[PDB]
Amino acid sequence: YEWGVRSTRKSEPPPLDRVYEIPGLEPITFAGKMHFVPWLARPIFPPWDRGYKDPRFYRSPPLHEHPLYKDQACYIFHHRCRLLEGVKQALWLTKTKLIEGLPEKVLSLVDDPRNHIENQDECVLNVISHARLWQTTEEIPKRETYCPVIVDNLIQLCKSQILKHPSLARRICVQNSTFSATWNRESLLLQVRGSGGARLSTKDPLPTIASREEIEATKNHVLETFYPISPIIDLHECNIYDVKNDTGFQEGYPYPYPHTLYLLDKANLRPHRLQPDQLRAKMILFAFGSALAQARLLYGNDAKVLEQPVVVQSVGTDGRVFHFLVFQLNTTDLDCNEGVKNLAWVDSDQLLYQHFWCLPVIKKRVVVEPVGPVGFKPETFRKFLALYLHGA
Amino acid sequence: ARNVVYPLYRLGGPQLRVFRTNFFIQLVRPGVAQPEDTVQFRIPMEMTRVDLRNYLEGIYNVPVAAVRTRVQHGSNKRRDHRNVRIKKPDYKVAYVQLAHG
Amino acid sequence: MKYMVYPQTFALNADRWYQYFTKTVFLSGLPAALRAVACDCLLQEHFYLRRRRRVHRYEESEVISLPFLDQLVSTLVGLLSPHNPALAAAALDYRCPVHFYWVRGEEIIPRGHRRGRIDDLRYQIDDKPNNQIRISKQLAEFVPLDYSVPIEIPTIKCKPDKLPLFKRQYENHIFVGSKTADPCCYGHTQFHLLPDKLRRERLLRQNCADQIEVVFRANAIASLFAWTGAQAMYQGFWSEADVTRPFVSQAVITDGKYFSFFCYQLNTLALTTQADQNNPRKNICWGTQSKPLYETIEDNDVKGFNDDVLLQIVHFLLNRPK
Amino acid sequence: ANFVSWKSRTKYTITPVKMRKSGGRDHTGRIRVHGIGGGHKQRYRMIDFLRFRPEETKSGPFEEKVIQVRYDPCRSADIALVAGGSRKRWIIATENMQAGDTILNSNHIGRMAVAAREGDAHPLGALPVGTLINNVESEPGRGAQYIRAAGTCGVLLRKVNGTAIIQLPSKRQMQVLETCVATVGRVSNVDHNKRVIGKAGRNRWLGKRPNSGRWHRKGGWAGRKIRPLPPMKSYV
Amino acid sequence: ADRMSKWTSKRGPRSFRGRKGRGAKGIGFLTSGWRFVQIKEMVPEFVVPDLTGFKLKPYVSYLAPESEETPLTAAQLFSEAVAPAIEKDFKDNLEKYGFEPTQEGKLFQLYPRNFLR
Amino acid sequence: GLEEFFDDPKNWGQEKVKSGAAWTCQQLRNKSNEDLHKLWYVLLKERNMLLTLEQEAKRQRLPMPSPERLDKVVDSMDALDKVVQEREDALRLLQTGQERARPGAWRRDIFGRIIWHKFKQWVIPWHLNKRYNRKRFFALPYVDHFLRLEREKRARIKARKENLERKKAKILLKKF
Amino acid sequence: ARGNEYQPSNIKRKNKHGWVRRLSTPAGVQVILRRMLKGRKSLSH
RNA sequence: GCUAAACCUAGCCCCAAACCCCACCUUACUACCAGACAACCUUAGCCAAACCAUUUACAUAAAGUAUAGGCGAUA
RNA sequence: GCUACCUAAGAACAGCUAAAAGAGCACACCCGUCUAUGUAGCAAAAUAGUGGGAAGAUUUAUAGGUAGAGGCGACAAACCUA
RNA sequence: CCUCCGCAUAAGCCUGCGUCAGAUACUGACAAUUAACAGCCCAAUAUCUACAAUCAACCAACAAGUCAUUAUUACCCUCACUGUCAACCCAACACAGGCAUGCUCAUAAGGAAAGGUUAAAAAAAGUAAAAGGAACUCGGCAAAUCUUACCCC
Ligand SMILES: [Mg+2]
Ligand SMILES: [Mg+2]
Ligand SMILES: [Mg+2]
Ligand SMILES: [Mg+2]
Ligand SMILES: [Mg+2]
Ligand SMILES: [Mg+2]
Ligand SMILES: [Mg+2]
Ligand SMILES: [Mg+2]
Ligand SMILES: [Mg+2]
Ligand SMILES: [Mg+2]
Ligand SMILES: [Mg+2]
Ligand SMILES: [Mg+2]
Ligand SMILES: [Mg+2]
Ligand SMILES: [Mg+2]
Ligand SMILES: [Mg+2]
Ligand SMILES: [Mg+2]
C-alpha cells in the first residue's frame, strides 16, 4: 500500500504535441509570444538557474553531493531524542553499569548539619510557591515557565551556601552550552550532540567516586541486551555528519570542567514531555557525552581505560519530579562489549512535592485543600544540595 | 520619484539613485498642539518616511531626528448637483522631529 | 483606554515626558576577583562559548548580551552574598514582568458622544527587566521624604499622543515581578538590557546622537517608577493614601558595553489631579551618564575594562536594607 | 469545489496524522454518502498492513516487540505499536496481544506446518489447516485487506496445490496463493459486537448523522432472502 | 455594498488592511518573525547637487529674447555630437566615435531603461 | 533650513510679489545636463515654497499672493522635464533605435481588446512566473460577439455625432 | 425577522463577485463583457 | 393673486455614402520569485395545428409552381 | 454574507444540587408555549409578560463547499437573499 | 430619576454633532487618526514528532484529543508599508428588531419615561377590593396561588 493518493500527488504534465514527435519540422510554439495561447504548441523550456547566488531563494545541493556525506551512518542523540528502551538503551550505548541510589560520598555531604541550609524547608517551600503560583500575573503558571524558574531558584538557594563553602566561587552556571562526542559501539558510530539545559561548570574536576577495585569489578557485569529492539532505535540516523569531539568551549576557557548538567523537560503537553525513563536515559547520555568530550580533550582520541576517571553529575527534572545521576566514565574503549565499564549512580522519580494547588479547592463553601504544595519531600532537595555541594 | 518604474534591484546591485526628484511636499501649520521640535508636512502618497528623511536632509540640509506618517482620508461625502459624490483627495501627513534640539 | 508607556522607547526626548507623567525630577549623579569574574562572563559570551548557529547582528543583543548580563547578575550575587547577607536571601528574577497602572492628569474628551466630559489620563507601564533582585526588607531612603529640590518637573504643552504614545484598553496590572503573596516584595536592583532597535549605532545613523542618554534616562525613570509604585501599592498605598515612607530602588541599564546607573525614590503616588492639586512631594531619579565597561574584545582579551563601572555595579549590589 | 484529499502524506510515520472529515461529500462537494458528518475530531494512525515488511537493508524472518496496545478511533479493532530493529510501526492487535510480547513475521514456507502462535505473521502455506487467521492479503505482497475488523477471524480450510482456501468472516471462501501472508489468531476488541450506543448523542459523536425522516415503502428486496453461499473467489 | 468608491487599504478586515498599500515602492523584504530587512540599495538616494554659486534663479527675466522651439531630434544630436568627428576621421569601428553596440555592461542602460527619471 | 519652505520675510504679507517669466523649453535646451539638474532643484525648492504658501493661504482663508508664479514654476519644471526627456529619447534612438523607454508589446487581453501591455521587471523567466501565467493574453471565441457589439456601439455613436454636426452646419448656413 | 439578509464581509464580497472570480470562468468573463458593453461604471464588485 | 402656466434647442430617429507617465487577471486598477491549467460537443421552448404526441417560416420572374406534410396545420 | 446540511480551525456556557449524567433548579445565551397589544405596526412577524432548553444531538463568530431537470433536508413537500 | 447598559477588540461603514462662516444631527471651508497595538513573514534537501486536555497531582475514563525537531548546506551588511476619526454596522428611516468576543456584574461609565394644560367616554398597562370562590368560559384563557390524583400519545 503506497501512501499518498494520486489526486494529491503532483499532476503529470500534459502529453507532448505530435509536432515534436515529427522529426524534420520545427514546431511553432507560443514562446515567441511570451505567454500561453491554447492554439499553439507548448514550448519545451530549457532548465533555468539564476546566474547569481541568492539567499532566501537558495536551493541546497542534492544530499549525496554534500561534502560531509558518508556511507557509514552516524546515529546522533540530541536533546529531543526519546529512546524506546530508555535506561537499558542508554546503558548499552554508553557501556555503563547502573547502581540504584546516589553514592555515599555525595549523600554524606548533607548528613552533617553544617552543610544544611538554614530554614531548608521554609526556603524550598517558598521557592516552590514562587515558581508555581507567584511567578507571573497568570493565575496558573505553565510548565514552560515554572520548570526553568524552579530549577534556577533551587540553584540560587544552593549557591547561597557560599558563606559556608568559599569553594563554590569557582563554579558558574552557563546557559546555551552545547557539547559533541562521538564513539563506536559494536562498529556503530554513535554521536551525542547535547544542548538545552544549564551546565554547572567548575574550575576543577570532580573527585572520582568508585575505586579502582570497583572499576575492575565492573568487568564481570554484563550489559543487559534487548532483542529485537536495536540499541539504535530512536537515534537520528544521519549520513551527512562530521565526526568531531567538541567540549563546547574554546581552549583556555575558565570553569572548563563540567560539574552538573541541569536538564529540564518544560514542555506543557504530556506527549511533548519526556517520560521519566526517557529523561533518565537522556541524562545518562548527556553526562556520558560531556565526560567523553572531556576525556577526548585531555587524554586524546585514544580508546583506552582511563587512569583518571571523569565524573559528571546531572539533574533531570520536570518541575515536580527529579532524577539524579552521577556518571563515572572510566574507559574510552567503548567499541568492545567486554572489559571495564563506565558506571552511573541513579536516583529515580524523586518528587519534590506531590502536587501544588494554585487555587483553594472548595466543597460546599468549605476549603478542603489550601493553596500551596502538598506532599513536600525535603529529601529530594537534600539530594539536590548534596549534588551541588559535591566537589566543594 | 513617483509615477515611474523603479529599476528592480537584485542582490549585490548598484545603489538606487534619483537625480530629478518628483516628490513635492508642503510644510503645513499643525491643526493641533505639537512639540516645538515637530514639523508637519503634506507629502505625496508614494513617499516613504525614509524618502522624506533623505529628501529633507539632502535638498534642505535639515537634520531630521524622527519621521512618522499617516494617510489622511479625504471626505467622499460631498455631492454635486448630479448627486455624484465629490471625492476630497486623500493625502499623506508626515510628522518630522528635528535633531540636535 | 489608557496610554501604554514603554520604558525602552524610541520616542525623542521621552525622558522629559516620562518625568512629567511621573512627577519625577531627574538629578545628575547619585545620592580583583570580581573583575576576573566580569571578564570571564564577557569572554564566555563573546569568545569562549562555541555557537553552533551563526550569530547575526540583529540577534547579537539577545544571544550575547542577555546571557552576559544574566551571568553577571548571578555570579556577582553569589560572590557578594558574603559581604551582603540580605543579598543571600534575595530572589533573583529573569525577565519577570513588572506592571504599574496609575492616573496622572485629566482631559476633556475632544470628540464623540462623550465630548466635553472630563476623563482621567490613565497610564500603564509593562516592563520586562532582564534581571531583578527582590528582597523582603525595604531599602533605606536615599533622601528624606519631602526633600525639596529646586529643579522643576518638565511640563508638556501638548497632548501625550504627540510624543509617539498610543492608547489601549487591556488588563490593568500592578505587579512587582511576583504576586502580592510573595514575601520578597521590595526591590533592590533592576538590570535592563536595551533592545536592538535602540542601538547606539542606529541612533547615530538616525541623527539621534543626543538621544542615547535620553533613552537610558527614560528607561530608568519609567521602569524604576513602575517598580517602586508597584511596591508601594503592594504595601497598600495609593493616590488617596500616599506613601508615608519613600520607596527606593536601583537600576543599571546597559546596551551590552555601555552601562548607566540610576537611583529612584518614590515619594508620591498622589498623581491624579485631585490628590496633586496641593502636593509638594515629587519623585526623584538620580542618574549617571553611560560609561563603557570595556573598550573592545579581541579574541581572548578584553581591552580597557572599567573597574569604576564594575565597582558601581558592586556598590549597588552591596546596598543593604537598614 | 476545491476539495483536496487530506491523504497526501507520502512517508510512513507513527505520529497521529490530522484528518479532515468529508461529511459524505464527494470531491465535487455534493453528498455522495448520507448519514456521515460531524463527530469527535480524530487523528489517523498510519497502519502497516504489510506485516512482513523487512526493514531496509534487511531480509528474511524478523521479530518485533509490542510496546503497547492502543485504542484506534479510526478502526473497530485496536492497534499495537510494534517495534523491531530500528523502526516502529502501527499494526492491528490480535485478541490476546499484550505489551512486551514478541511477534514473529516470516516469509518461510517450511515443508511442515509452523506451530501457529497468536499474533505472528506466516505465509498461508506455512499454517496448519484449520487455524484462525486475520489480515489476509488478496495477492502476495499486496498487503492485508480482509479480516481487519474487531474480533474477525478467517479460517484456513484447505491447501490444495500451491493455493490456500480461506473462510472469510462472511463465510465466503477465498483462494489465494499460499505465499501470501496472514497473521494468526482473531483480531482484538472481540467484544466490539456487544457495544451499546445508549444515546443518539453517542452516534453523533461517532459521526453518524440521523437517518432521513422520509418514509419508504419496502419492496420485493425487503423479505428475508436465503441464498446458497457464493462460490469461491479466486485470486490465482 | 459600496462599489463606486475606490478600493483602498482603509477598507476590509485586518488582513486586507495590512496587505494593501498606497503605492509606496518597497524598500526591503520580510523574514521569519515578520522582521523587516531594509535594503539600502533599494532606498532611492536623492542625488542633490551643490547649488552654491549657481546663477539660474527659478524665474527668467521678462526682458529676454524669444526663440523658436526646435525640439531636439536624433538627427540633430547626431549632427551636433558625432558628425564632426566622423568628418574629421573620414578626411583623415563606430565605438571610437561613440556608438555602443549593446546597452549591457552599462550602469545606465537606455533600453530597457534601468534608472529613475 | 526650513526657512526655505517660506517666501522672504520681507515678502510675507505682501499683496503681490513680482516674478519673472517661466523658463521656456528652447531656453532650457541651451543649458547643460548639470545645469538642468541644478535648476531642477532650484525650481523644486521654489515649488515647495509656493505650495506651502497656497496651503497656508487656504488655512487662513486668504488669497495666495501672486498665484500665477506657482503656475510659472510648474510650467518651468514641465519644460525642464520635457527637455531632459527629449535628450534621453534622442540618445536612446541613436544607441538602440527604440522609441519607447519601457519594453512592451501589443497583446490581446481576455476581453479581445488590443492593448499595449507594458512589461514589468521580474527575477524569474515568464514561463516560470506563476502569476504571469495566470494572467491571460488571449480571447476565446465567445468574445467575438461582444467585440462586434462594441464595434457597432462605437459606429452608432460616431454616426450620431456626424449627423448632428451636419444638421448644425445646415442650420448655421440657413441662419447666415 | 427578515430583511437583514446582507451580513457584509469584504472577504465574501470579493471572493464571490470579485474581478478575479468573474474572470475565472468564461461565464463571468461574459458578465464583465456585458457590463462593459452596457457602459457600467462598476464592472465587478 | 398664489400655485402655477406656457417656450426652442439640447439632442435623438430613419437612410445614403464610407469599412472600423504610473497601476491593473492576487481581494483588478496591487513595483519585485520554480509555472504546467487551459478553447471547440445538434439549441430549446413558447406558439400554430383551435388539445397534443410527427410537424410549425427565421433585386424581379419562374412561383407560392415542382415538391414536402398526423398529405394538415403549414413548409 | 439569509436559510438546509457539511468542511477547517476558533469561542461561550454564572451560581446552586448532584456527580464523570444527550442529570435537576437557574443567569448569560438559544428558542418561541400561552396570553395581551400591534395589524400601513417600533417591526414586510415586533413589544410586555409567561414559558422550553441552557455541558450538549448545545449555541455561536470567521472562511470555504453543495445551485435549480439541482442542492440540502432528525420529510415540515422544510429551506435555498423578505 | 433610569441604567437594559457601558468601555474596548473584531466585523461592518468610510469622515457621518471637531473649528470657522452661511443658512435655515444642513451647506461650504479648514483641520484631523503619528506605532510600540494589529496586519504584512519564514532558504533548501532529507529527517524527526505513540504517551491528550481537564490547577495534571491522585483517581476516572471515552467521544481518543490545537500546540515538539534534528543532519548538512546557504545567510546580515540595513526597523519599511498599511489600519488607527465618529454619535458608526445589517434592517428603505435618529427603526422598541439583528449584532461575535474581553472586562465592568452595577457601575467611576452611559442616559431622560413628562412640549404645556385638563383629568370626559372608549381603549392599553398596572394596583386595591366587601361577601362568595370557577358559579365565568369551549377550556381556570388571563390573573392569583404553589398546589392532589387518574388517563390517552
Ligand atoms: Mg422512518
Ligand atoms: Mg451570519
Ligand atoms: Mg396548440
Ligand atoms: Mg387561439
Ligand atoms: Mg453551569
Ligand atoms: Mg441538562
Ligand atoms: Mg409528511
Ligand atoms: Mg402534505
Ligand atoms: Mg502607522
Ligand atoms: Mg422625554
Ligand atoms: Mg402630552
Ligand atoms: Mg374580592
Ligand atoms: Mg362551569
Ligand atoms: Mg376546584
Ligand atoms: Mg355558564
Ligand atoms: Mg395560565
XYZ file of N, CA and C in Angstrom, chain B residues 18-87:
210
model
N 18.084 58.674 -7.524
C 17.141 59.524 -8.236
C 17.774 60.897 -8.372
N 17.832 61.402 -9.601
C 18.530 62.647 -9.890
C 17.602 63.851 -9.902
N 16.474 63.760 -10.592
C 15.491 64.835 -10.629
C 14.272 64.351 -9.851
N 14.249 64.675 -8.562
C 13.184 64.215 -7.685
C 11.832 64.695 -8.186
N 10.834 63.824 -8.072
C 9.477 64.137 -8.487
C 8.555 64.430 -7.314
N 9.022 64.225 -6.086
C 8.213 64.465 -4.901
C 8.241 65.942 -4.534
N 7.062 66.545 -4.426
C 6.912 67.911 -3.945
C 6.059 67.883 -2.689
N 6.546 68.525 -1.632
C 5.918 68.450 -0.324
C 5.485 69.844 0.103
N 4.625 69.884 1.115
C 4.117 71.127 1.676
C 4.407 71.147 3.165
N 4.925 72.260 3.665
C 5.052 72.458 5.102
C 3.786 73.145 5.591
N 3.031 72.471 6.455
C 1.699 72.926 6.824
C 1.666 73.263 8.305
N 0.829 74.232 8.646
C 0.629 74.591 10.041
C -0.140 73.481 10.746
N 0.371 72.935 11.846
C -0.362 71.868 12.531
C -1.736 72.339 12.979
N -2.714 71.442 12.876
C -4.049 71.734 13.356
C -4.240 71.545 14.840
N -3.291 70.889 15.505
C -3.345 70.654 16.940
C -1.991 71.017 17.530
N -1.969 71.189 18.849
C -0.722 71.497 19.531
C 0.295 70.392 19.287
N 1.514 70.785 18.947
C 2.596 69.862 18.649
C 3.838 70.266 19.424
N 4.749 69.327 19.671
C 6.008 69.687 20.326
C 6.794 70.683 19.490
N 7.640 71.457 20.169
C 8.348 72.543 19.500
C 9.236 72.034 18.375
N 9.733 70.807 18.482
C 10.669 70.269 17.507
C 9.979 69.538 16.365
N 8.650 69.539 16.327
C 7.896 68.802 15.326
C 7.449 69.723 14.202
N 7.586 69.234 12.974
C 7.170 69.929 11.767
C 6.207 69.023 11.020
N 5.129 69.597 10.504
C 4.109 68.832 9.805
C 4.201 69.103 8.314
N 4.199 68.036 7.524
C 4.245 68.136 6.077
C 3.096 67.347 5.473
N 2.639 67.806 4.319
C 1.769 67.032 3.450
C 2.602 66.528 2.282
N 2.519 65.227 2.031
C 3.504 64.501 1.238
C 2.788 63.751 0.123
N 3.427 63.506 -1.018
C 2.839 62.582 -1.991
C 2.645 61.208 -1.375
N 1.561 60.545 -1.772
C 1.195 59.287 -1.138
C 2.243 58.203 -1.342
N 3.074 58.314 -2.371
C 4.050 57.281 -2.687
C 5.373 57.466 -1.960
N 5.486 58.465 -1.093
C 6.738 58.791 -0.428
C 6.783 58.112 0.933
N 7.808 57.299 1.157
C 8.016 56.692 2.458
C 8.629 57.706 3.419
N 8.604 57.368 4.708
C 9.239 58.235 5.690
C 10.748 58.265 5.507
N 11.344 57.157 5.068
C 12.762 57.173 4.721
C 13.006 58.128 3.562
N 12.128 58.088 2.559
C 12.254 59.007 1.438
C 12.159 60.448 1.907
N 11.227 60.739 2.812
C 11.098 62.101 3.319
C 12.337 62.516 4.097
N 12.884 61.608 4.903
C 14.089 61.927 5.658
C 15.228 62.295 4.722
N 15.471 61.461 3.710
C 16.543 61.758 2.766
C 16.250 63.033 1.989
N 14.992 63.234 1.602
C 14.597 64.437 0.885
C 14.949 65.685 1.681
N 14.520 65.735 2.942
C 14.789 66.907 3.766
C 16.278 67.072 4.027
N 16.983 65.977 4.311
C 18.391 66.089 4.665
C 19.270 66.423 3.470
N 18.828 66.121 2.254
C 19.640 66.372 1.083
C 19.302 67.674 0.394
N 18.011 67.945 0.205
C 17.630 69.147 -0.522
C 17.645 70.367 0.387
N 17.305 70.202 1.663
C 17.191 71.323 2.582
C 18.230 71.311 3.693
N 19.033 70.257 3.808
C 20.045 70.171 4.856
C 19.418 70.380 6.230
N 18.265 69.762 6.440
C 17.539 69.839 7.704
C 17.854 68.577 8.499
N 18.491 68.678 9.666
C 18.777 67.465 10.441
C 17.513 66.855 11.022
N 17.109 65.705 10.493
C 15.866 65.049 10.877
C 16.180 63.974 11.903
N 15.475 64.009 13.033
C 15.677 63.019 14.081
C 14.718 61.846 13.960
N 13.441 62.116 13.703
C 12.448 61.063 13.582
C 11.388 61.500 12.587
N 10.750 60.517 11.964
C 9.693 60.763 10.993
C 8.573 59.763 11.224
N 7.343 60.259 11.227
C 6.155 59.427 11.294
C 5.184 59.887 10.221
N 4.398 58.950 9.702
C 3.484 59.246 8.612
C 2.127 58.623 8.892
N 1.095 59.238 8.325
C -0.259 58.720 8.402
C -0.999 59.152 7.149
N -1.906 58.302 6.688
C -2.679 58.560 5.483
C -4.008 59.161 5.909
N -4.191 60.449 5.636
C -5.438 61.119 5.964
C -6.464 60.856 4.874
N -7.629 60.351 5.270
C -8.678 60.022 4.317
C -9.463 61.279 3.972
N -9.489 61.630 2.690
C -10.281 62.761 2.252
C -11.753 62.394 2.171
N -12.599 63.341 2.558
C -14.029 63.077 2.626
C -14.594 62.790 1.244
N -15.419 61.752 1.158
C -16.165 61.430 -0.049
C -17.653 61.700 0.118
N -18.039 62.405 1.180
C -19.447 62.614 1.484
C -20.077 63.686 0.608
N -19.315 64.704 0.221
C -19.876 65.802 -0.550
C -20.385 65.301 -1.896
N -21.474 65.908 -2.365
C -22.125 65.509 -3.603
C -22.416 66.734 -4.453
N -22.277 66.585 -5.766
C -22.514 67.679 -6.692
C -24.000 67.747 -7.036
N -24.354 68.622 -7.979
C -25.750 68.768 -8.371
C -26.317 67.492 -8.972
N -25.467 66.600 -9.472
C -25.910 65.338 -10.040
C -25.961 64.220 -9.010
N -25.842 64.546 -7.726
C -25.889 63.565 -6.648
C -24.722 62.591 -6.701
N -23.685 62.914 -7.462
C -22.487 62.090 -7.541
C -21.498 62.582 -6.498
N -20.960 61.654 -5.713
C -20.044 62.022 -4.644
C -18.810 62.713 -5.205
N -18.417 63.812 -4.570
C -17.170 64.501 -4.874
C -16.134 64.020 -3.873
N -15.029 63.480 -4.374
C -14.003 62.897 -3.522
C -12.945 63.944 -3.205
